[PDB]
Every structure is written in C-alpha cells, then in structure tokens.
Amino acid sequence: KRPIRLLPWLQVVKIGGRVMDRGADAILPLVEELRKLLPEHRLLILTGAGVRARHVFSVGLDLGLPVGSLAPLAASEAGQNGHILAAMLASEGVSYVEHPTVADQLAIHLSATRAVVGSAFPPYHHHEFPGSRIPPHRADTGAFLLADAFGAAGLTIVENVDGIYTADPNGPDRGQARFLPETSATDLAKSEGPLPVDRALLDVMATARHIERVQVVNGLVPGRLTAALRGEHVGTLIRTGVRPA
Amino acid sequence: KRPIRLLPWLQVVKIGGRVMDRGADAILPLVEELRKLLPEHRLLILTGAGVRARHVFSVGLDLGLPVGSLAPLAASEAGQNGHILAAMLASEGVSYVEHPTVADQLAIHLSATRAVVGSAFPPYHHHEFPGSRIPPHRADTGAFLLADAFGAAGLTIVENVDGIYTADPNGPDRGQARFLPETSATDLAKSEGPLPVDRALLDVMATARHIERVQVVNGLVPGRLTAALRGEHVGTLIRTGVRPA
Amino acid sequence: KRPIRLLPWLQVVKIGGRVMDRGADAILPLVEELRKLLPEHRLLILTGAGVRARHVFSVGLDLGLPVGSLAPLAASEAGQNGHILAAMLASEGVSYVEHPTVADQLAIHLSATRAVVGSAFPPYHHHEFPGSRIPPHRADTGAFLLADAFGAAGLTIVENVDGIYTADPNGPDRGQARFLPETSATDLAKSEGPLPVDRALLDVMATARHIERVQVVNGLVPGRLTAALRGEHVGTLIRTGVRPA
Amino acid sequence: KRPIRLLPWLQVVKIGGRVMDRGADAILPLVEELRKLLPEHRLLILTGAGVRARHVFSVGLDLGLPVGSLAPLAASEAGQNGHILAAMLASEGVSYVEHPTVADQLAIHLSATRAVVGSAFPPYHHHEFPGSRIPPHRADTGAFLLADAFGAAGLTIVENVDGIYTADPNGPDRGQARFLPETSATDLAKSEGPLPVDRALLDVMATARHIERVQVVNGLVPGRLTAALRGEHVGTLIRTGVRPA
Amino acid sequence: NSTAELEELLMQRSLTDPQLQAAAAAAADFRILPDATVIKIGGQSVIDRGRAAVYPLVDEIVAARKNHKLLIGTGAGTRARHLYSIAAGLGLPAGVLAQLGSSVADQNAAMLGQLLAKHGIPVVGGAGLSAVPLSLAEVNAVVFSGMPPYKLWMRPAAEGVIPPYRTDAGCFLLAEQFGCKQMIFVKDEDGLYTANPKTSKDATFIPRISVDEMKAKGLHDSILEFPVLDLLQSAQHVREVQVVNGLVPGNLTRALAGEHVGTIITAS
Amino acid sequence: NSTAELEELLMQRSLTDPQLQAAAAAAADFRILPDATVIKIGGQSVIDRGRAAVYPLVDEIVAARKNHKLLIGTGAGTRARHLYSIAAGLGLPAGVLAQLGSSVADQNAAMLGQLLAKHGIPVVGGAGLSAVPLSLAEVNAVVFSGMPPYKLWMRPAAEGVIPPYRTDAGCFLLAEQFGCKQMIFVKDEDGLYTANPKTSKDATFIPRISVDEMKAKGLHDSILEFPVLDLLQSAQHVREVQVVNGLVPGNLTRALAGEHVGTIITAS
Ligand SMILES: Nc1ncnc2c1ncn2[C@@H]1O[C@H](COP(=O)(O)OP(=O)(O)OP(=O)(O)O)[C@@H](O)[C@H]1O
Ligand SMILES: Nc1ncnc2c1ncn2[C@@H]1O[C@H](COP(=O)(O)OP(=O)(O)OP(=O)(O)O)[C@@H](O)[C@H]1O
Ligand SMILES: Nc1ncnc2c1ncn2[C@@H]1O[C@H](COP(=O)(O)OP(=O)(O)OP(=O)(O)O)[C@@H](O)[C@H]1O
Ligand SMILES: Nc1ncnc2c1ncn2[C@@H]1O[C@H](COP(=O)(O)OP(=O)(O)OP(=O)(O)O)[C@@H](O)[C@H]1O
Ligand SMILES: Nc1ncnc2c1ncn2[C@@H]1O[C@H](COP(=O)(O)OP(=O)(O)OP(=O)(O)O)[C@@H](O)[C@H]1O
Ligand SMILES: Nc1ncnc2c1ncn2[C@@H]1O[C@H](COP(=O)(O)OP(=O)(O)OP(=O)(O)O)[C@@H](O)[C@H]1O
Ligand code: MOO
Ligand code: MOO
Ligand code: MOO
Ligand code: MOO
Ligand SMILES: [Mg+2]
Ligand SMILES: [Mg+2]
Ligand SMILES: [Mg+2]
Ligand SMILES: [Mg+2]
Ligand SMILES: [Mo]
Ligand SMILES: [Mo]
Ligand SMILES: [Mo]
Ligand SMILES: [Mo]
Ligand SMILES: [Mo]
Ligand SMILES: [Mo]
Ligand SMILES: [Mo]
Ligand SMILES: [Mo]
Ligand SMILES: [Mo]
Ligand SMILES: [Mo]
Ligand SMILES: [Mo]
Ligand SMILES: [Mo]
Ligand SMILES: [Mo]
Ligand SMILES: [Mo]
Questions:
Q1: Residues ≥6 apart with Cβ < 8 Å to E17
Q2: Sign of torsion, CA C157 C158 C164 C169?
Q3: How many CB pairs under 8 A join A and C?
C-alpha cells in the first residue's frame, strides 16, 4: 500500500525564476491571472531562482566553493523571487511563508487564506549531493518532492517556453528543436542534452507515490496556467510512472 | 477577585502518549472521532510522550544526567506524537504549533482553523525542579497549567484506561483495582501508589483559578471523548477545588 | 510614479505607551472600544513604550551606553505593552505578532482574524542613528514608516492628550498652551519645543509616498478613536505633504 | 435616550440610478472601485431608479394612475439596476438581496460575504403618501431610512454630479449654479428649486437618530467614493441635525 | 576553459546543459576544513547502550582532541525505529518519517554534549562553519546531530517509507562538503564481514574493500546505509571511509593515529 | 547637571523636550569595543570580482588579525542591483527593496566566511557583542553582513525607491555604535577623486577632505553612500573614515598599520 495523501485538495504551482527575471512585463499579467485563480483553487506557489543564481554560481565557483556551499546561495534567490511575488499579491491576503512553515503548518495557513508563496528550492543546503559542481536538487525538484509528499492534486511548472523541445529552443541547435506535447520521465532521463526542468526532477519522479503527471506551460501566455490547473493540455505533459492504486 | 479568562470558549484535550504508542489501531479511530468534533468545538489538542520517553530516561539515567536534562528529552517525544497526530488531521486544516505560538498566538490560530495540536509538556527544560530523578512537570501537568491559565472551558485527559482505579489495573495488584467514578485532587494527593496522571497535576490543581473538574476517559473506546466534551460522565472526574465566583 | 499600495484596505492604530501606563482605568474602556471596531476595520494595532523606557534610559545613560544600545531597550517596553493589549483582546481572536511577521506575513494574519497587535518601535536596534543620546526613531516614527510603506488607508495616533498644543499642556508653560486643530508636518518641524509625537515622525512624513494626514486623538475619551477611523475631526490633524496622484 | 445601533459597523452606499443609466462607461470603473473597497468595509449597496422610472411615470400619469400605483413601478427600476450591479460583482461573492432579506437577515448575509446589493426604494408601495403625483419616498429617502434605522456608520450618496449646487448644473439656470461644499438639511429644506436628492430625504433627516452627515459625491470620478468612505471631503456634506449623545 | 567561458555558459544555457556542467567541473576546488575528522557515533550501536559504551568514548574524544580536530555526529537508534514503525503503520510518507528521526538524533547529541560540556566541547549548528570552537586547542571539537536536513523534502527509497538518507549519510555529506581529511563511522562490530556477524557464525572479516567489490558480494546494505556507498563514489573530497568498533577501548584513538583498525571502504 | 536632574526630566517631559535632550547629551560615554576596526569589503568593487580580488584580501585579513581586532562587513553588489531593478519596475517601495538587498549581502558574508573558517573566523550575529570571537588571539575577527536591519521600516530617499541606507551605512553605524577606533571602506579605487575616475580621464586624487568640503565640490554621492557623510557628522565615536583600494595587495594591511593610503574623510 502507498502512503496516504496529506493534502489531497492542494494544487502546487512552480514559477520559473527566469519568468520573474523578466520583471513587470511578465509578472503583472501573471499576478492578475493568479488573482483570478485564488477563488478556484487552494494554491501553494513556489518560486525558482533564475539568473541571479547563475551569477552567484560564477562567483562561488571562481572562489572554488563546493556544491554544498552553492546550494543555499542559489536557494536565496528563489526566496527573494518569492517575496517579490507575494508582495504583489498581499492585497488579496497572500504572503510568503518559510520552509519550516510549509513543512509543518501549511494546512492552517491554507485555512486562513487562499494561497501562500514559498521557495521552490529544497533545504538540502550543505548536505547537497556531490558529483556535479552545480547543485542538482533545484526548484523543479523541490516543488515536486513537496507536491508528491503532500499527495497534492497536481504540480504545474510555469516556464518561459511552451514546454519541452528536442533541443534548447533558445540555444545553438534551436533550428532542429521540435515541440514535445507529451513525454515520460524515463524517456527524458535516457535522453542527453538540456531540458527546461532539473534532471533530478526525473529521478524523484521515478520514486514518486502519487503525482502521475506534471505539465510544463508557458507563463508568458495568459490563460495557460488557468487551463493547466483544470487539466487542459496546453504545454508538455510529463508522465511520472506512478500509475493508479 | 480571580484573573480573567483569556480564552473562555477554548476546549483543551490531552492525548496520552501511550494511546499514540498503540499505532494505527488506536490512532485511526481517534482521528476519525476528532474530525467529527472539529465543527463542534474550538480545540487545543496536546500530546503526551509515552514509551519513548521511558527509553530516553533509561539511557539518560544510566549516563547519570540530572532531572533538568531528562525533562527536555522527554518533551521531545511528546512533540513527535504531536506532529504524527497533526499530520493525520492535515486535510481538515489542522497543524502542529510550537510552544511560543501556543503561548502568544493561540487566538489567531484558532481563528484560522478549528483545532491545533501542540506538545503537552511544559517548557520547564533545564529549570525543572529537583528532588525526583524523574521530571515531575509532565504532559498532564503542562496541559492543565495551560488550560487553567487560559481560563478554558475544560480539560479532558484521554487515556488508555477507563479512568483512575485504586491500583494500577495493568500492574501487580490489578486484582484489587476498583474503578473510581469521581474523586478530588486533595484526596488523590493524600493517597500513595501509582496513578494514570502526574502527581504534579494534583499540586497545580490546588492553586488553580478556573477549571473545576478534569475528566479522564478511555480514548480506546470511540465516543467517550465526544461525550466528555459535552460534560457526560464516562470516566473519572477529578474535582480541583476551584469553586465558583 | 509612486510605489503601489501593498495593503490599501489596512488601518494602522498606534497606542501611546503612556495610555497603557494608566492601567485598567484607561485600558478597559479602550479594549471595549477596540472590540466594537473589529468588525468595522482591518486593524494593525501598534503599541508605544511609555514610562518604563524612561527608566531604562536613566539606567542606560548612567551606565554610559550609546543610542544604539538604548534603542532596543526601549523597544522592549513597547513589545510588553503589545502583549498586554493583545491578551485583553485574545477572546476576540487577537494576538501579538512579531516584527518579522508584520513585515512579511501581515496579509495572511489579517485574513485569519480582524486585528493583530505589534510593537510600534522600528527595528533600528544597534543601527540607530547617532546624534541625540535619545533614540530618535521611536513608536510614532515606526508606526508611520509601516503605515506609509504598506500604503495603508490611514494612521491614527492615540494619545493621553487631545492633540498637539503650542506648549506641553502638562508642563511648566501649560498656561499658554493653545490647542492646534490642524497643522502641517513642515510647520511643526520648524517649531522648537516639545511635541506629543517624535520629531523623527515629521522627517519621515516629508518623504512619505501615500499617507496624506495623520490624526492625533485622546484615547482617554471613549469614541474618539472610533470617530477618527471614520475621518471625523476630533483631535489634531497633521498634514504630511503627500498630495494626490 | 436614543435607540441602540443595530449594525454600527455597517457602511451604506447609494448608487444613483442615473449613474447606472450611463452604462459600461460609468459602471465598469465603479465596479472596479467597489471591488477594491470590499476588503476595507462592510457594505450595503443600494441602487436608485434613473431614467426608466421617468418613462413609467409618463405612461402611468397619462393613464391617470395615483401616486401609490407609480411608487412600486419606479421601485422596479431600482431593483433592476441592483441586479445589474450585483451581477458585475458576482465573482467577488456579491449578490442582490430582497427587501425582506435586508430588513430581517442583513447581519447573516454580511457575515457570509463582504457586500450585498439591494433596491434603495423603500417599500411604501400602494401606501405612498398622497399630495404630489410623483412618489416622494424614493431612493435617497429609502437608503437614509435604512442606514439610520440600522445605526450604520455612514451613508454615502453616489451621484452623476459633484454634489449640491445653488441651481441645476445641467438645467436652464446652469450659469448661476454655485457649488455647495457643505450644507444643512434644514437650510436645504427651506430653499426652493431642484436638488440632486429627494426633498423627503431632508424630512427624514430631521427625525434621524444616529446619522449626523451624509456626503454626496461624483461616482463618475474614480476614487471619490473611496475617499468619502474614509470621511474625506470630496463632495457636498449634508448635516442632518442629529448631534451627539 | 576560462572564467569568461564558464560565465557565458552560466548565463546562456540551462543548468542541465552538458556543456555547462563540464565547464563547471573544471572549477578550482576549495576545502573548507581540510584538517578536521568527522566521526559518527552510532545511536543503536553505541549511545543506546548507555554508560558502558558512551563513557569510554567520551574519554577518548577528550584525549584525542589535543592532536585532532573532530566533528562528532550522533546517530539515532531504537527510538527512531519506534517512531518509524508508528508512522509507517499510519501510511505516513518518508518525508514525515525523516522529521521524526531527526528529533532522536538531536536527543543523542544533547546527551553526548552534556557529558563533554565541562571539557569545553559544545553541541553546535553549522559545525563545518563553527570555526571558532574548532580553532582552539582548549576545544578543537564539536558535537552535532547526524540527520540530514531534508525533512519533508527527503527523497524516498524505491520501496517503503523508511528515509534512505539517515545519520550515516548526514555525517558523510558533512565531511564531504567541508573537505575533511577523514571519515570514521563508530559502530558495535569490528568492521565489515562477509555477512551480518550478529546472525552468522562464520562470517569473515574484510579489512579493505571498494564500493564495487561490496556490491558484487551483496554487501550493499550491510554495516553502512547503502546510499552512503553511492555518495562515496560521487564524492570530491572524502574518497574512503573507515568503520571501527567503538565498544573496544582505544579503537577511535588508534584510528585517528593512522592505525588500520576496522574496515576501510574505498570509492574505487 | 546631576543624575537626579536627568531622571526628573526623563520622567516628567516628553523625549522631544529640548531640555531633556540637552541633559541626555551630558551623559557619560562608554565605548563597547574601543579597540576594534570595522572593515567593509565592497560587494561590487571586490567580492563580485571573484578569486583575483577576494583571495589576496583573505590572506591579508588572516595576517592582520594577529595584531588587530577586525569586524569585517560585506557589501552586496550586482545581484542586489538586479533585484532593485526588478522590484522598482513593479512599483515596490524602498522598504521591500531593503529586505531584498540584505539577502545579497548575506550571500557574500557566507562566501567570505567559508574561505576564513579554517582560520577560526566565523560569520556572526551581534558582531559588536560577539565578544568571544574577538577576544581570542587565535581568532580576533568576525565576518558580518553589512546591510542595516531596517527592512520594511527603511526610510526612503527623497526620490526613487532605492534604499538610501545600504552596506556603507550599515557598516559605519556598527563601528559608531560600538565605539570602534577605526572605519575602513575597502573598494576598487585608490580613494576619492575630483570626479568618478571610471568615467573621467583627468580626475585628481584627494588624500584628505572633510564632509563639508566634499559637499562644496559636488562629491556628496561619490565613492560612499551620501547618507554616510551625514551620519559621520552626527557621530559620537567614529569622526573620520578611510577609503582604500582592496585590489592593491597590502593596502588593507598598511591602512591598519597607520599608513595614509587612500583617502581620509573627516567629519569636520
Ligand atoms: N529541451 C528544451 N526544451 C525547452 N527549453 C529548454 C530545453 N533545453 C534548454 N531549455 C532552456 O531552458 C530555459 C528555462 O531555463 P531554466 O529552466 O533554467 O529557467 P527557470 O526554470 O525559470 O529557472 P529555475 O530553475 O531557477 O526556476 C528555456 O528558456 C530554454 O531556453
Ligand atoms: N491507579 C491507577 N488507575 C489507572 N491507571 C493506572 C493507575 N496506576 C497506574 N496506572 C497505569 O497508568 C497507565 C497510563 O500510563 P501513563 O499515564 O504513563 O501513560 P500516558 O498518560 O499515555 O503517558 P504521558 O504521560 O506521556 O501522556 C495505565 O495504562 C495504567 O496501566
Ligand atoms: N506641544 C504638545 N502638545 C501636546 N502634548 C505635549 C506637547 N509637548 C509635550 N507634550 C506631552 O507629551 C505627552 C505624551 O507623552 P509621550 O508622547 O512621550 O507619550 P506616548 O506617546 O504615550 O509614549 P510612546 O512614544 O512611548 O508611545 C503628553 O501627555 C504631554 O504631556
Ligand atoms: N441643485 C442641484 N445640484 C446638483 N444637481 C442638481 C440640482 N438640481 C437638479 N440637479 C440634477 O439632478 C441630477 C441627478 O438626477 P437624479 O437625482 O434624479 O438622479 P439619480 O439620483 O441618479 O436617480 P435616483 O433618484 O433614481 O437614484 C443631476 O444630474 C443634476 O442635473
Ligand atoms: N556484513 C556486515 N558486517 C558487519 N556488520 C553488519 C553486516 N551486516 C549488517 N551488519 C549490522 O549493522 C550494524 C551497524 O549498523 P547500525 O545501523 O546498527 O549502526 P548505527 O550507526 O548505530 O545506526 P543508527 O545510528 O542509525 O542507530 C551492526 O550492529 C551489524 O549487526
Ligand atoms: N569621485 C569619485 N572618486 C572615486 N570613486 C568614485 C567617485 N565617484 C564615483 N565613484 C565610484 O564609486 C565606486 C565605489 O562605490 P561602490 O558602491 O561600487 O562600492 P561597493 O562598496 O562595492 O558597493 P556595494 O558594496 O554596495 O556593491 C567606485 O568603483 C567608483 O567607480
Ligand atoms: O505558527 Mo503560525 O504563527 O500557523 O500561521
Ligand atoms: O505569527 Mo503567525 O505566522 O500567527 O499563525
Ligand atoms: O507563518 Mo504564519 O503565517 O500566521 O505561522
Ligand atoms: O434566510 Mo437566508 O436563506 O439568511 O441568506
Ligand atoms: Mg526551468
Ligand atoms: Mg497518563
Ligand atoms: Mg506620543
Ligand atoms: Mg439623485
Ligand atoms: Mo518566521
Ligand atoms: Mo518559521
Ligand atoms: Mo515556527
Ligand atoms: Mo515559533
Ligand atoms: Mo514567532
Ligand atoms: Mo517570527
Ligand atoms: Mo514563526
Ligand atoms: Mo428570495
Ligand atoms: Mo426573501
Ligand atoms: Mo562559533
Ligand atoms: Mo559555538
Ligand atoms: Mo556562538
Ligand atoms: Mo559568542
Ligand atoms: Mo561566535
């Protein structure tokens, strides 16, 4: 038997740090869409890190620091994005909550208000796994670990692209990049090349207990997040390999 | 004149650590009964410690540690029981809250949701009283101190036995153990022999300002907690010696 | 363009520490008036320090301590006044909240309950400005900084006098003290002599972005706070020099 | 002694029927302003009748019908305006409520949601007073009767003009029309000539028990309603002649 | 491979890009506490046994810190297994079990720390950064709780809800993160055997073995948490660990002096 | 002026009363850490430049703390400017920007602290009270984040939402609060010039100048946050500051030895 679902009515939304990096032009339409979603769902909104984590990686690696030092330095930027997003939603009752609050008191906070914002990075900190010089357990990974641990109704990953392509649609091989409407985590994990999601996300999907699909959608197109939260197919669906009880 | 009542509408429920020790067979029916009680009362649920505190006492005493070292080590187990219980109730909006939150922000948390869970041990810590090598201010004592300080409507102690007997109904003299439907704290304090409640509970009852009765009921019998919270006599009533204004 | 309003529906109320110093005779009618205001507004209630800060200043200065040491020692007394006030309102769902909670999670707490209480002193601490041996950024200043940063609907300062006079109405020149129904911050800042509000309040008013007026009213006269929160002129109005967009 | 206040925390807002007559160009900015006011106040929004009542008066008078027949025919148009306004606010939890609901169950409905909408016309119906062939107890009158009976915190009348002038600012003598920032009901009642408010409003003001002032503001200027509800002077203030207890 | 080449990739490519990962692998490598030793004191194997096991180890730690900087991590033990059994029977997930287990390792750190307080040695937070206790000859040692901080974000095992990363992994990753020179697991057996010696009569002692040889013999989940073996093969700084019997007086002291007591498990 | 005279006024008059303020000004003046030096390491000017700038400064700090007690504060840098730009474009107020900027200064303190941990030097809280790290010859230094704690209660500037009190002010007020003997700002230019030398070809070096002379020359907001100049004129303990180039090897060491490298800015 699988573990019970702790918050089966919860919807988790991960906002890519690079969406926030675009500033008001991206954030204002997203805030407006989130505002209209508040009466429809019970939302845990988790922010990624984006470009500032890249800069602190550049300084940190130049200083020679190990992966367990770089992990909390990148998490910091996800937290700042979360404070920024929550501030824009304060007038609707939304605040940023800390990791201990998310892990132990999420139920009471979602009883008080319709949504909260937190950092998507998991608290692996100085106990990050070695191997890569880049912390593997990042924002997509932390959001999925939480969503699946809670037994949430879904996790939706909100990106600055339409979904997963066969190559980086903003990179050198952009010309041969083909859109992938649906994929499986095991298929992706066997591929080589870049992805819009952490590779570690594919690993924790393999051991997941509840979440069957995760959809990656373009948060720069208004309405896609709303449609995804109703299960409409508007980006890339990732099948996790959990299949029903 | 006596002090005012801070939360006169509050009901405090203490769950014995040994009830939790029985695992799912005991906890699942209790969780279901608590769930149906949520719309009826405003509940502060406090968990005791149980058998794991006995083990840490065995190690601690073997190491020679004083009573002020053993007190927070036992409190830890009450807190873990509280996290376990709250997790089972998360989908109904219930979370575990810390001692500082219970002492300073209980009002706002019970405005947000119908019940919270906390540790019944009081924060006496390294300032526990000397005398016994066993910490005297344990879960029953901490729950009563809080309930009476708040001026709560009641405190109900939920045990793995029907109430107070003339001897341990699970011990050597079990054969001569007679059930006590009602008793007074002063009568109990003059008796010698074991009890299902801390002896320190009898002492703080003597200085109490508001709570007149505390009922000890069998949480292994579904419906007894529900009846006790409506004032029905289904276990042992302890008269504290507070009598009305 | 000016910054957005974070909590435009919020009303901030600052309770003078010297009002609390009068004990039950002042606090009980104030608590009753606050209770009837709870269903009408969304209140952030901030307490000042009062006479105990004067005593710790006397000891601290005698010990030679600098202004950055005296600032958190005075803030402590504002916090204690806040715990006292909140305790009197606990049965209505009101609790004291800490500065980090006010700064990052006020939205969710005012979603859970109708009012919260906090310390009016700002967290300048050991980084208080030098110059005076008396900390300049005190309770009036901290309350206004918060209210204006939030873009709140108003800030009302609740005193033990009717408002601002031309001299201390409790001091040596009391005989020539004339009541000032309305004034501007810039006019006050050019005056010399004592005031019922921090001089630093006048400075932050000069850089304010949203709050146009702050009314000082006598909290010892029941109904004045209620009238002030509806914009009725019952004390001294201070014009900040923000004028509309 | 005066009667108690039934809903002292209530704010009553009357929307002129002629504001609604302007359609989306007027209604959409008003709906947006009302939406941002919802978290700040507890609102009873009452709609007037406007031009359609003029048409039914023309038909009714041509048919010779008495004033007690014309009164419910005009009230109908106020009710339709109320359904229109409420529909625009439905997604925020606002609905139209009937007169019996306003008179007997307003407390529970304002416990469920932040605002409700009703018809401002009073239910005088076929028992309207004789004298004029035009029903005297219209929308302004009905809104004030309710607001004062409830002991509400205020009544704000939202018009298609800045306030009360010395002549109709849209009529023949428009050239000599001077704005009146403040006035008394008794002064207005002694004047002859048209007004933006029912003459009967002046009469019920004379017997009022609680409401001291009513402000008439231009709902076609965004922000004036918001300012008026905080007691800022942005239109014409009418003093009723109630003065305090 | 230049700083400009790495910084361009860090800005222009996803962190998942193999080209970025490879440039990052070429970065310089700083050891934060290269001269410290991380020691794990087993919860079940040592601390749960009480005075007869703990007191001799306290004496060794006190004597050893005169010549050695020590980060001393605690295991959890039977109270954690009790909590795991309760929570597992309720259907609670591994992330909830991980939080429960941490409290037990915290208890053990507090009990150890109180026996060492009169020698100046504290129980700490950010031990690998607790630079001030480690830099003094009068101190030269810290005690910490050995559980990793993952808590609700614990990755579950392939089967079951028992957190796969517990106090062996927590202590090992701290040693690895801070670039410590040595990692010693203090348990209740002389070291690794061909089979569990508590159950087998004729198990054979293994003085030295690599991770791959251990997997080839079915010893992947034997005296160490099996994920520690995989963590060890990916490690940058701690490429071998040593397992010794803390119930034998002087074993810890002799391991710190370079004696080949117990079993040495190498990454390769 | 007696203690009784001051205590009467403290009880009977508003803190705004000029008579009370004057009696308070006559109180004795205690210096909490009179023998320490506060050093600010610039975020943009030093730490963002990486190994080539930071590693030589680490070496100097390690050598210098043998003869000098040091409180080492970090600036923030380009990541804070990125956050300020995002937040400003959203209309967020200065109080929200101040919180965001603090996280970046915290990052820099952690990176510096990890390079110094093996020398015993910690990253701290209440550095000016962190009496135990400062009192040891083996340590004698702490690292702290340089942002003031005002956060949402930050007073805004006259124009715009950029917090006016940032890491120059945070470090300076700490030096002033604790009565330290010296305040050194470590940047990336030799000191103050007649104009920004990064933009001007013929700017002239200024070895020594008062706050008023700087204002008279339009240098009010040049190499230091302009509020620091006003803070300096109101200071009780730190009546002058020194600005030196941290990219020049030994500059910090020589400033600590009393050499007049860089620019000395005096209150009067
Ligand atoms: N196969 C791929 N399909 C789609 N996008 C890709 C692929 N490979 C690389 N990318 C790139 O990944 C980018 C998203 O970058 P990234 O995932 O690092 O940002 P983010 O998720 O917003 O950041 P964070 O992980 O901090 O939340 C896209 O803009 C795209 O350029
Ligand atoms: N006179 C008595 N009457 C009833 N029970 C008794 C008596 N004396 C001893 N007991 C024993 O007390 C047991 C309850 O144990 P205990 O009170 O320690 O557990 P608990 O209250 O669940 O633990 P905690 O105090 O940690 O919450 C009963 O099962 C019974 O065996
Ligand atoms: N010009 C003035 N007008 C009115 N009151 C004055 C004036 N000058 C001095 N005061 C004095 O200020 C007193 C209020 O004191 P103060 O403002 O210190 O108390 P408080 O605001 O309650 O304290 P806190 O700032 O700790 O909240 C009044 O009682 C009055 O005696
Ligand atoms: N003295 C006056 N001052 C201001 N407006 C006046 C005056 N006399 C007449 N008016 C007219 O009254 C008009 C408002 O008309 P009226 O009050 O009938 O509409 P309403 O209040 O929207 O309708 P209802 O009573 O159905 O709600 C203004 O547009 C203005 O032309
Ligand atoms: N092949 C083997 N060789 C040696 N010991 C083995 C082997 N297989 C299993 N074991 C068992 O592993 C035990 C050590 O692991 P254990 O988890 O008990 O130590 P621990 O560090 O105390 O754990 P914790 O700290 O989690 O309580 C030994 O007591 C031994 O019985
Ligand atoms: N007149 C001047 N003389 C010298 N430098 C000047 C002058 N005017 C402007 N500057 C600039 O000020 C810079 C130092 O300020 P800056 O804020 O960059 O230092 P910092 O301490 O690194 O800041 P932070 O810590 O906030 O990143 C120098 O690089 C220089 O270009
Ligand atoms: O512990 Mo809290 O203060 O639930 O939202
Ligand atoms: O301080 Mo809280 O975050 O009331 O539930
Ligand atoms: O963080 Mo909370 O919002 O009231 O515990
Ligand atoms: O009678 Mo009702 O159906 O209160 O809103
Ligand atoms: Mg991504
Ligand atoms: Mg018991
Ligand atoms: Mg005052
Ligand atoms: Mg009208
Ligand atoms: Mo917090
Ligand atoms: Mo927290
Ligand atoms: Mo907490
Ligand atoms: Mo807490
Ligand atoms: Mo707290
Ligand atoms: Mo907090
Ligand atoms: Mo908290
Ligand atoms: Mo109805
Ligand atoms: Mo009705
Ligand atoms: Mo430390
Ligand atoms: Mo320490
Ligand atoms: Mo410390
Ligand atoms: Mo310290
Ligand atoms: Mo320290």
A1: A168, A171, A193, A194, E9
A2: negative
A3: 42
CA of B55 to the centre of ligand 5 (A): 20
Q: Are B7 and C91 within 8 A, CB to CB? A: yes
- Which domain covers residue F146, as residue numbers? 1-268
DSSP H or E stretch at residue C81? helix C67-88
Pick the closest to residue C70 from C55, C51, C50 (CA basis). Answer: C55
Chains touching C (at least 3 CB pairs under 8 A) are A, B, D, F
CB of D139 closer than 6 angstroms to any ligand 4 atom: yes
Q: What is the largest CA-CA distance in chain C?
A: 49
Contact call for D9 and C39, based on CB within 8 A: yes
Token pair for C132: 């005076």
Instruction: Determine the atom of ligand 4 nearest the C-alpha atom of D165.
Output: 3
* Chain A CB contacts of E153 below 8 Å: 103, 122-124, 137, 142, 145-146, 149
The pair of three-digit structure tokens given for residue F33, joined into one six-digit string: 């850490």
Max Cα–Cα distance, chain F, nearest Å? 61
Taking Cα atoms as reference points, which of B105, B208, B104 lies closest to residue B155? B208
Q: b or e along F62-91 (b: 16 or more beta carbons within 10 Å of the residue's beta carbon)? A: bebbeebbbbbbbbbbebbebbbebbbebb
**Whether E207 contacts chain A with CB within 8 A:** no
Domains of chain A: total: 1
Domain count, chain F: 1
- CATH number for position D178: 3.40.1160.10
By C-alpha distance, which of D44, D46, D123, D116 is closest to D78? D46
Q: Which domain holds residue D96?
A: 1-245
- Residue E183 has phi, psi (to 5 degrees) of -135, 120
> At E20, is the secondary structure helix, strand, or coil?
helix
- Are A22 and A81 in contact, with CB atoms under 8 Å apart? no
Contact yes or no for F225/F164 (Cβ under 8 A): yes
Report how far apart, in Å, the C-alpha atoms of E150 and of each of A136, E103, E155, E165 are.
14, 13, 8, 9
Q: Are D12 and D44 in contact (CB under 8 A)?
A: yes
Closest CA to D35 of B15, E89, E58, A92: A92
Question: Cα-Cα-Cα-Cα dihedral of C207, C210, C213, C219, to 10°?
Answer: -100
User: What are the chain B neighbours of E51 within 8 Å (beta carbons)?
Assistant: 62-64
Where residue F157 sits, what CATH number does that domain have?
3.40.1160.10
In a 13 Å sphere around the CA of A151, the CA atoms on its Cβ side amount to 19
Helix count (H) and strand count (E) of chain C?
Answer: 9, 9
Task: Quickly list H helices, chain B.
Answer: 17-21, 24-37, 51-62, 67-88, 99-112, 139-150, 185-190, 199-206, 224-229
Q: CA nearest C126: which of E61, A78, F179?
A: F179
* Residue whose token pair is 């006079």: C165
> Which E-chain residues 107-136 have CB contacts (< 8 A) with chain B?
107, 110-111, 114-115
Q: Is the CB of F163 within 6 Å of ligand 6?
A: no
Q: Which residues of D170-193 are buried (b: 16+ CB within 10 A; e: fewer)?
A: eeeeeeebeebeebbbeebeeeee
State the method. Answer: X-ray
Ligand 1 atom 5 nearest Cα: A196
**Residue E132 with chain F: CB contacts under 8 Å:** 120-122, 132-133, 136, 139
- Nearest-by-Cβ selection for C130 from F95, F161, F236: F236
Q: What angle do CA F87, F88, F94 make, to 5 degrees?
A: 90
